[PDB]
Amino acid sequence: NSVSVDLPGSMKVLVSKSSNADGKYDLIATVDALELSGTSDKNNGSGVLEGVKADASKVKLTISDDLGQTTLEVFKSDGSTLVSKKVTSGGSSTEEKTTTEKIITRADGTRLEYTGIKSDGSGKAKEVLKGYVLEGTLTAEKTTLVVKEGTVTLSKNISKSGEVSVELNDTDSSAATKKTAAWNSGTSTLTITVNSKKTKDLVFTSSNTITVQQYDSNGTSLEGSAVEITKLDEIKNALK
Amino acid sequence: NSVSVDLPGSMKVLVSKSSNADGKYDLIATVDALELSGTSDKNNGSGVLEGVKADASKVKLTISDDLGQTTLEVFKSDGSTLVSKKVTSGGSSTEEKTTTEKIITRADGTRLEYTGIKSDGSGKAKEVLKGYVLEGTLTAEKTTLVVKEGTVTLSKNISKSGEVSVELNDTDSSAATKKTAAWNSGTSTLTITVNSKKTKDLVFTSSNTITVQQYDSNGTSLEGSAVEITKLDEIKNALK
């Protein structure tokens, strides 16, 4: 029945072999994983096609009359404002993406900077603190700032609600050095432990700072006083 | 007369001492070097103010009925799409800028990646060629990719139209090693001169490749064959 026509950008349009009562042809396609359709006055496979993904957002693929160009536009749920736009023609493609950048500044001066936020909530993230910064990423579900030392990765997650939760992963094999950790929401504290004995309590203060306090060699209670971290190096040290 | 009122974000509004016949108050303000004007139903200074920039663009400030949170908002001169948005509450700000990102991938695998394009036309532009990546910057008038070696700055400009023109600057004072350069657009050829004698021809081609060819110690003609640059190091050498 319907013919198939190849398009710039490695896409395929399906064009009805014969016209309907109105004198128009039915165009179908499937860009990525989403079905697009429409009608046109021409039989080669040129025209406009539309669709909607999981969200309300509207999608419009425009095949130019001579099949030399293809314009894939993606707007907001209202079908009004542009999110993405990809123009392909003669091997060359131009891709425009509307992104966003957000700088949250806190009462104490410490900031949270997101750059290159795309429509899916992804983007680079960075917490600028006092004397050091924590770089990381941001997805639609949480922000994760990372600090790695040797075989240990420290993840500070910030939920969409702004909730803070810390975890620590040690790929080390020797159970004499492997660090495990337990987070207590009720205290903003994370307790590390190497070889069946707790070693450090990392407290994340309401003042967007971190204190570190060592246990005794028996890993029973604490000793001395907590020292507030000032540079990234002290964090890494605590992670050793 | 008109009374001044303090506002989060280190701002100040000017609200008439008493209302008009319709019973409203006149809010006048100036943010940065642009002024905004509105009318409100309350005397404390809350309400909406509006303006338009010296570059023609819509802006709408909004104070809250309790004066607790301020909301600066900029649009396109069309005044119906979000550009900037800064909200200060309790001393904590929260700014937001919509930025675009374009990825022009040429038909030969060479790319031009513009990221963080802001409203003025500024942004970070990086050209990804075959074997090396040039980095630079984007203004509303021209893209400029830079390569520096010693006291030599080589700049490759891509005009708004797309014309590629290259220039060379040298801050070396000694007139025995200071390089100079002349651009010939009829051939896309940059010619380097060291100590009054011409030394190198750097040709930027249609395939987004650079070829370097030495003159003789004469300083009067090309000797041998031109060689295509394959990585950044050969460029920097050409600039030595």
Curated annotation (Swiss-Prot), chains A, B:
What residue intervals traverse the membrane? none
The protein's UniProt keywords, in alphabetical order, are:
Cell outer membrane, Lipoprotein, Membrane, Palmitate, Plasmid, Signal
Report disulfide bridges, numbered on this chain.
none
User: Where is this chain's protein located in or outside the cell?
Assistant: Cell outer membrane; Cell surface
Changing P8S has the effect of: In strain: CA7
Asked if the keyword Cell inner membrane belongs to this entry, the reply reads: no
Result of mutating I63V?
Answer: In strain: CA8
Domain of life (superkingdom): Bacteria
Q: What is the effect of changing G131S?
A: In strain: PBre
What topology does the record note for this protein and the membrane? Lipid-anchor
- Primary subcellular site in the record, as a coarse category: membrane
Query: Is Membrane a UniProt keyword of this protein?
Result: yes
Which InterPro entries does the protein's record reference?
OM_lipoprot_Borrelia, OM_lipoprot_dom_sf
The entry's cellular-component GO terms read: cell outer membrane; cell surface; membrane
- Tell me what the record says results from E163A: In strain: CA8 and 21343WI
What is the recorded function of this protein according to its Swiss-Prot or TrEMBL entry? Induces host (human and mouse) cytokine release by monocyte cell lines via TLR2 and CD14; nonlipidated protein does not stimulate host cells.
Question: What family does this belong to?
Answer: Belongs to the OspA lipoprotein family.
Instruction: Provide the protein name.
Output: Outer surface protein A
